[PDB]
Structures are given as structure tokens and as C-alpha cells.
């Protein structure tokens, strides 16, 4: 066969160890899921530093904890604007997922609270910024560089999927690179805890699996398709399906045809044909061996999965080095108290 006895026993034991870790992982998650933490800081504990972002539901601000001097990225959400945009369940669910998950490649919620007007999510601050900007700047990542990021995503999805969480918004825009060069997944606004199938049309056009486009029910296998899009974009510099309007992107997505740059290795193309697989009965991540089809693929043969999880692998790139930010009113009356009881 492909493996003699020693390699087969080693792989078997590693896979058994993953099950054991995931089982304890679920247990820790479910406790926090069933009893979420609330109100663990207040606004005047922080100095406003800089508005890093602004959006439909609120703003992101770099803040500095007055006591400890630590910096954080504080998502401020206008409760009334959340209500008017019909985003109550998404907001509640995002915070509830973030306070329950624990994984070295997932951005951590350090505090959360609310006041009369707003909801606040105080996150770990990642000054390196988004993968998107590094990728567009450098152009494309070499395959060993792309692979180091991909391995972290594979592990994170293996973790989330074991919790029955589908992530649904993978893209370089949502992947931050921390000061050791490792990935922080951000923005759980479209994540859903569901065991079976779900139907919501959501995600980013370039990254949508065909069965989302085709109005089928779908499951966690859409995240493995999105992994294929991500690996392709990291290694090519552009995504596998693009056009100037979304509708023409969807036509390419469902067509079952993808083309590769001539510098893609054959191992990479094989992996991507198995991830970017329209037929759900053939898509890696979705078969009887689950995620092991991906972890065991030839393109990941040099990947030490434990060393990656333990963050012992030297990153291929370290963003240039606290608080570097280069590369709000509170009503006397409480608004929307009932809607946000759980926050």
C-alpha cells in the first residue's frame, strides 16, 4: 500500500488523538454556549484612540484599557440601528459564538458589555491587519507560504465543524495576520450552529459554493469549497471565478470548470479539483473520511499539523511592527432593552 506499518500506525494514533481533543473541545464549548458570559467591562475602562472602521450597524475603534495599557479592537453597535436593519439575531448569535469558542486561530472576545445606546465587543487587536492587503501587495504567495495559512484554516474548520458551526464567510478580507505571522479568523456574522442543512443565501460572491447559488439546502461542505477558493487565490493572486458582475461569477462557479496558472504544482491542482468539486459526493471534506482526505493529501505532506496548532512553525512572513494604526454618544434613556437582554 502507500504506507508501511510504522507510518500507518503513527497516522492512526494522530487521528485518534484529534477525536479525543475534539471531544473535550465540544464539552468546553457547550458549557459556555449554554451559559454565556455577559457584562465583563464598561466603556469608561478604555481610552478612545482611533476609529479604525465604520459600517451600517456601528463602528470599530482602537481603544486602550486604562488600567493595563493593553490595546483592543472595540466593535461598537448602535442598538437602534441594529434593530432597524433587522440584524438582532445575527448580532446576538455572533457574540454568543465568540464568547463560547476557543482556538488559537480565532480572534478572541476579551470583553463585552452594553449601555443605554450600544453594544460593545472588545476583541484582541491584530495590528498586522488583513491577509487581503498583504496578498494584494505581494501579488501571490508561494505554495509553501499559501500552505502554512491553509493548514491553519483546515484546523480551524475541523474545530468549528466539530461544534456543528458553519463559518460561511471565508476570504482574505476576514483573515488577520498576527505578530507571529499566524492567522486570526475574524467576523462570525454569518456563522450558524446547525447540525443538518441550512438555506440562507449569504457569503461573498467569489467564495460561494455552487449549492448556495443553486438554492439547494447546504451543509458545512460549503466551507471546504471556500477553502479551495482561498487556496487558489493565495497561490494565484486572483480567485478562480471572477467577472465584473456577480451573476457571471455564479455561472462560472456552477459550470464545473476551473483553470489553473501554469505555475501551480500538480499536487496543488489535484487538491483544488477535489475541493472545488461541484458534486457533493466527491468533494473533499464531505466524504466518509471527512477532513482526513484534506490533511492526508499530497500537497500537505510536509505539514506538521501539531506543530502548526502549537504555533511552533516559523511563519513565512511577519508583518512590520504596539498601537501602530497605519498598515460616540450614550442616551440617558435605554433603547431596545428587551431585544438585547441576552447580550
Amino acid at each position: 500500500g502507500h504506507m508501511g506499518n510504522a507510518a500507518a500506525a503513527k497516522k492512526g494514533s494522530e487521528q485518534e488523538s484529534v477525536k479525543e481533543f475534539l471531544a473535550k473541545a465540544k464539552e468546553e464549548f457547550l458549557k459556555k454556549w449554554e451559559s454565556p458570559s455577559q457584562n465583563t467591562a464598561q466603556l469608561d475602562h478604555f481610552d478612545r484612540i482611533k476609529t479604525l472602521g465604520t459600517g451600517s450597524f456601528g463602528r470599530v475603534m482602537l481603544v486602550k484599557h486604562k488600567e493595563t495599557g493593553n490595546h483592543y479592537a472595540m466593535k461598537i453597535l448602535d442598538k437602534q440601528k441594529v434593530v432597524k436593519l433587522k440584524q438582532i439575531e445575527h448580532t446576538l448569535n455572533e457574540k454568543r459564538i465568540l464568547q463560547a469558542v476557543n482556538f488559537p486561530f480565532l480572534v478572541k472576545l476579551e470583553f463585552s458589555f452594553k449601555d443605554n445606546s450600544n453594544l460593545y465587543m472588545v476583541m484582541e487587536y491584530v495590528p498586522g491587519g488583513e491577509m487581503f492587503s498583504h496578498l494584494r501587495r505581494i501579488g501571490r504567495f508561494s505554495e509553501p507560504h499559501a500552505r502554512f495559512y491553509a493548514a491553519q484554516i483546515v484546523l480551524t474548520f475541523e474545530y468549528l465543524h466539530s461544534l456543528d458551526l458553519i463559518y460561511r464567510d471565508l476570504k482574505p478580507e476576514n483573515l488577520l495576520i498576527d505578530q507571529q505571522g499566524y492567522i486570526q479568523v475574524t467576523d462570525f456574522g454569518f456563522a450558524k450552529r446547525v447540525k443538518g442543512r441550512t438555506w440562507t443565501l449569504c457569503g461573498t460572491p467569489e467564495y460561494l459554493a455552487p449549492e448556495i447559488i443553486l438554492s439547494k439546502g447546504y451543509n458545512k461542505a460549503v466551507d471546504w469549497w471556500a477553502l479551495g477558493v482561498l487556496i487558489y487565490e493565495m497561490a494565484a493572486g486572483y480567485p478562480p471565478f471572477f467577472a465584473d458582475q456577480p451573476i457571471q461569477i455564479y455561472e462560472k462557479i456552477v459550470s464545473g470548470k476551473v483553470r489553473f496558472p501554469s505555475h501551480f504544482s500538480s499536487d496543488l491542482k489535484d487538491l483544488l479539483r477535489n475541493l472545488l468539486q461541484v458534486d457533493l459526493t466527491k468533494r473533499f471534506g464531505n466524504l466518509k473520511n471527512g477532513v482526513n482526505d484534506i490533511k492526508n493529501h499530497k500537497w500537505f505532506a510536509t505539514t506538521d499539523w501539531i506543530a502548526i496548532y502549537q504555533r511552533k512553525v516559523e511563519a513565512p512572513f511577519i508583518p512590520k511592527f504596539p498601537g501602530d494604526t497605519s498598515n460616540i454618544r450614550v442616551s440617558i434613556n435605554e433603547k431596545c432593552g428587551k431585544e438585547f437582554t441576552e447580550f
Binding site: 487581503f132 494584494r136 464567510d169 476570504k171 461573498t204 460572491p205 471572477f242 465584473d244
Partner: peptide, 18 residues
């Protein structure tokens, strides 16, 4: 070329969810 097509797509910037 594919890269030139990508540039011409107008979708080289940060992409919004639908």
C-alpha cells in the same frame, strides 16, 4: 491574460458579502 482580466473585472478591492 487571466491577471489582466482580473484587473479589468473591477473586483480587485475588498469584497462585500451579499
Amino acid at each position: 491574460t487571466t491577471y489582466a482580466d482580473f484587473i479589468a473585472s473591477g473586483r480587485t478591492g475588498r469584497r462585500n458579502a451579499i
